Amino acid sequence: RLTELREDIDAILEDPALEGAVSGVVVVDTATGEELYSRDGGEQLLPASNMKLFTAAAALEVLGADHSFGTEVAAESAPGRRGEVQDLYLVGRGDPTLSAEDLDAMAAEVAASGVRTVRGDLYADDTWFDSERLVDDWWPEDEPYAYSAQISALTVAHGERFDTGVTEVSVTPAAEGEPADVDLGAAEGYAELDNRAVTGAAGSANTLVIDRPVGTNTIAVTGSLPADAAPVTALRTVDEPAALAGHLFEEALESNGVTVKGDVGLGGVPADWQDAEVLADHTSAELSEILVPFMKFSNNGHAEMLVKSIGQETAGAGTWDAGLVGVEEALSGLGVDTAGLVLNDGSGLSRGNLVTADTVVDLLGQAGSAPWAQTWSASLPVAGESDPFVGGTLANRMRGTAAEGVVEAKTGTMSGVSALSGYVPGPEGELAFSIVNNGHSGPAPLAVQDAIAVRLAEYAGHQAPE
Ligand SMILES: *[B-](O)(O)[C@@H](C)NC(=O)c1ccccc1Cc1ccccc1
Ligand SMILES: [Co+2]
Ligand SMILES: [Co+2]
């Protein structure tokens, strides 16, 4: 095809959805190196979550595909005869998957290694990273939601998708007139609850709202929920994620016969502790396994944690500023030319980011030529696949088309921003593309993205199913 394929994409790209918008669309054969389509490939645009590609590759570079994260528990000395200690520390070192059950097993160890009592205070130590909890230009009004999760070294991850810094809020109706039962889940007895919610008559106005008023650690429920309606689970953030982890760990300890007589709160392992006793430790799966629930579902926590991890590796500075310089650096070292990159964050959430479709495709190029390449591939959503962990953010797109089970792309979405970028493998060769829609006045031009994606899939020796 080539110029015929060009014509096909030229046709797609006029669509009345893309009215008033800029679009970096770039296609390259991995093998031939040749450029197969270009348009505004050098234009600066916000990537939203496509930023994640840059973060993922950097992290792979700087930490290696087999890097593992640690949590541990420490006291100044071994427990004393009746099984006692003074202060006690739960210490995060950036594990983006540390779970309530992981906490449990660590508690069980503290018991197993002799401790009957924490006769002083328990600290949640998250100082491996700085404590700047949110990016300069993140929007305040987003904060209660999961994707705006606070960023902290010590952070508990909820459910199999390892969403950090949240709690699940359960809202279950009673009967018409009667109020509704609200659970804060993991955050119970950590965050405040202000339940003004009320079950309404069956099949009526659903007007429920689960909020955390800016600057507070209070879950505000308000509005109505119909009696016949199904129970609403809902993911919501909390302030100081390490304090929550502290609280959960108190719960864990007491639940393993370890009494905690003092306060729970934030604290760093003191410098005057030269022979600290590591009573318990946990180790996350290596970075390879972590990239999946990260990239599949586009997890902001993980991204921004890895930036601060890149920060700690290259500079010993668990900080966006260093993490970010260590991102630019990593990439330059990968062959990627970063002239057009503007880094504000690692997830894409920052409006302050900028990219170009060549900078993307460049990166895609350099990535498939890598010791890690394979694990990089394993992270990206694969179109039209039911199983959330295969489909990721593309599970419900390009179904029953050439691209289904073929195209390896990464999504990026925001009020005025869309993006699709990855690999089109197949019989007639591998292929690499970037489509970065920006400023479109309506809904995210997903039809265009998908229509182009299928085009390439056919171009690779695939057929639409029947
Ligand atoms: B990325 O997936 O573009 C990511 C940075 N976007 C968000 O986290 C985001 C921004 C604004 C509103 C909602 C969300 C969540 C989201 C949006 C699309 C796909 C996945 C998650
Ligand atoms: Co509790
Ligand atoms: Co096929």
415 is catalytic: no
Beta sheet of 218-222, edge-to-edge order = 192-195, 218-222, 209-211
User: Which two three-digit tokens encode residue 295?
Assistant: 């990239």
Are 425 and 334 found together in one domain?
yes
* Ligand 1 center–CA 381 separation, angstroms: 15
Structural domain including 85 reads: 69-129+241-284
- DSSP string computed for 108-140: HHHHHTT-SEE-S-EEEE-TTS----S-TTS-G
d(CA 330, CA 61): 6
Same domain, 375 and 466: yes
Answer yes or no: are the C-beta atoms of 330 and 323 closer than 8 Å: no
Question: One of 23, 49, 99, 309 is an active-site residue; which one?
Answer: 49
Final residue before a domain boundary, out of 253, 284, 315:
284
Closest among 189, 202, 162 to 250, alpha carbons compared: 189
Is-catalytic flag, 224?
no
- How many whole angstroms from 463 Cα to the centroid of ligand 3? 6
**CA angle in degrees (0–180, nearest 5) for 334-97-184:** 140
Ligand nearest to the CA of 419: 1
Q: Mark 283-293 as b/e (b = at least 16 C-beta within 10 Å).
A: ebebbbbbbbb
Contact 25, 39 (CB under 8 A): yes
Domain final position from 187, 220, 240: 240
For residue 273, what are the contacts with CB-CB under 8 A and spacing of at least 6? 74, 76
327 and 386 in a single domain? The answer is yes
Please give the Cα distance from 333 to 444 (Å, whole number).
Answer: 34
Ligand 1 and 298: CB distance under 6 A? yes
Are 146 and 269 members of one domain? Answer: no
Using the mean position of ligand 2's atoms as its centre, give its distance from the Cα of residue 428 in Å: 56
Cβ 269 vs Cβ 280: under 8 Å: no
347, 454: one domain: yes
147 Cβ below 6 A of ligand 1: yes
Q: Measuring from atom 17 of ligand 1, which residue has the nearest CA?
A: 413
Tokens at residue 393, please? Answer: 């953010």
The amino acid occupying position 78 is: A
Shared domain for 190 and 222, answered yes or no, is yes
Residue 238 CA: which ligand is closest? 2
Catalytic choice (23, 288, 298, 309): 298
Residues with CB under 5 A from ligand 2 (ion): 188-189
**What domain count does the chain have?**
3
CA neighbours closer than 13 Å in the CB half-sphere of residue 199: 19
Residue to probe by mutation, ligand 1, list 344, 360, 413, most atoms within 8 Å of CB:
413
Tell me whether residue 296 is one of the annotated catalytic residues. no
Secondary structure class of 434 (helix, strand, coil): strand
CA-proximal residue: ligand 1, atom 14 (nearest): 147
C-alpha angle 225/183/226, rounded to 5°?
Answer: 10
Instruction: Tell me how long the chain is.
Output: 466
Statement to judge: residues 6 and 121 lie in one domain = no
Query: What atom in ligand 1 is closest to the CA of residue 147?
Result: 8
Which residues are found with C-beta within 5 Å of the ion, ligand 3? Answer: 406, 462
Q: Which ligand is nearest to the CA of 254?
A: 2
Angle (nearest 5°) at CA 82 between 81 and 85: 85
Q: Is 413 in the pocket of ligand 1 (CB under 6 A)?
A: yes
**From the CA of 244, how far away is ligand 2's center (Å)?**
9
CA distance 55 to 355: 13
Q: What is the CATH number of the domain that holds 384?
A: 3.40.710.10
Last residue of a domain, one of 210, 240, 270: 240
Regarding the beta carbon of 145 and ligand 1, being less than 6 Å apart is answered no
296 annotated as ligand-binding: no
Distance 146 CA to ligand 1 centre (A): 10
Any atom of ligand 1 within 6 Å of the Cβ of 135: no
Cβ burial of 181 (10 Å; 0-12, 13-18, 19+) is middle
Experimental method: X-ray
Same domain, 314 and 192: no
Ligand 2 centroid, distance to 189 Cα (angstroms): 4
Q: How many angstroms is the resolution?
A: 2.8
Q: Which two three-digit tokens encode residue 123?
A: 């600290």
> Do 297 and 399 sit in the same domain of this protein?
yes
419/437 Cα distance (integer angstroms): 6
Examine the domain organization and report whether 138 and 125 are in the same domain. Answer: no
Contact of 221 with 129, CB cutoff 8 Å: no
Instruction: Return all residues near 424 (Cβ < 8 A) that are at least 6 apart.
Output: 403, 406, 407, 408, 430, 431, 432, 433, 453, 456, 457, 459, 460
CATH number at residue 261: 3.50.80.20
In a shared domain, residues 194 and 321: no
Shared domain for 399 and 453, answered yes or no, is yes
